[PDB]
Amino acid sequence: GPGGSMYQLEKEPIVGAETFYVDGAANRETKLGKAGYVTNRGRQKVVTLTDTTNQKTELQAIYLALQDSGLEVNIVTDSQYALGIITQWIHNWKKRGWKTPVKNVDLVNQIIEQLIKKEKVYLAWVPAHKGIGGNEQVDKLVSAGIRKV
Numbered sequence: 586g587p588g589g590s591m592y593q594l595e596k597e598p599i600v601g602a603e604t605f606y607v608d609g610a611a612n613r614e615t616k617l618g619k620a621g622y623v624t625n626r627g628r629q630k631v632v633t634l635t636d637t638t639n640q641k642t643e644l645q646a647i648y649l650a651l652q653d654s655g656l657e658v659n660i661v662t663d664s665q666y667a668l669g670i671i672t673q674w675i676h677n678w679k680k681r682g683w684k685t686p687v688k689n690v691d692l693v694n695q696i697i698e699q700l701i702k703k704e705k706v707y708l709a710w711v712p713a714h715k716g717i718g719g720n721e722q723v724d725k726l727v728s729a730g731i732r733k734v
């Protein structure tokens with residue numbers, strides 16, 4: 586939010602703003618993964634990761650979307666975990682009686698650091714699904730060589 590402040594996440598998509606369909610995939614046997622995005626302005630990025638989990642790769646993809654976007658961004662994720670953990674970090678901003686998540690604290694903090702630098706962010710969850718659209722596109726990119734699609 587404007588100034589280095591809480592500001593809640595947006596209730597609906599930011600009209601006009603670029604949309605990042607994010608995704609991560611990891612294989613538990615090897616802890617290898619990929620995180621990345623595709624956008625409706627034709628951008629795309631995929632990064633490979635090691636020592637990672639499916640939850641970490643989903644957060645990493647959101648981090649990449651925030652690093653690579655302007656002041657207003659729509660992010661569509663299929664990780665309800667990623668949505669929930671970020672959302673309550675914001676909803677419970679500061680406040681004693683809030684207590685820190687035990688896992689992925691480092692990388693959620695990095696996401697919070699990015700989020701604070703934005704004007705407006707909309708984060709939405711969709712179920713993973715089949716088709717030709719954005720979530721399916723990025724799903725294929727990060728799943729290649731990580732898990733059977």
Ligand SMILES: O=C(Sc1nnc(/C=C/c2ccccc2)o1)c1ccc([N+](=O)[O-])s1
Nearest residue numbers: 608609610639640663664665666713714724
């Ligand atoms: O990454 C995954 S499996 C993975 N990794 N973290 C999670 C889930 C976190 C979570 C939290 C609450 C409810 C459900 C899930 O699930 C994808 C499967 C299909 C994908 N796809 O079409 O993109 S992504």
Ligand SMILES: [Mn+2]
Nearest residue numbers: 608609663664
């Ligand atoms: Mn996913």
Ligand SMILES: [Mn+2]
Nearest residue numbers: 608610713724
């Ligand atoms: Mn996927």
Ligand SMILES: [Zn+2]
Nearest residue numbers: 616635636637
């Ligand atoms: Zn390693």
Ligand SMILES: [Zn+2]
Nearest residue numbers: 656657704705
């Ligand atoms: Zn603006």
Ligand SMILES: [Zn+2]
Nearest residue numbers: 694695698699
């Ligand atoms: Zn940092």
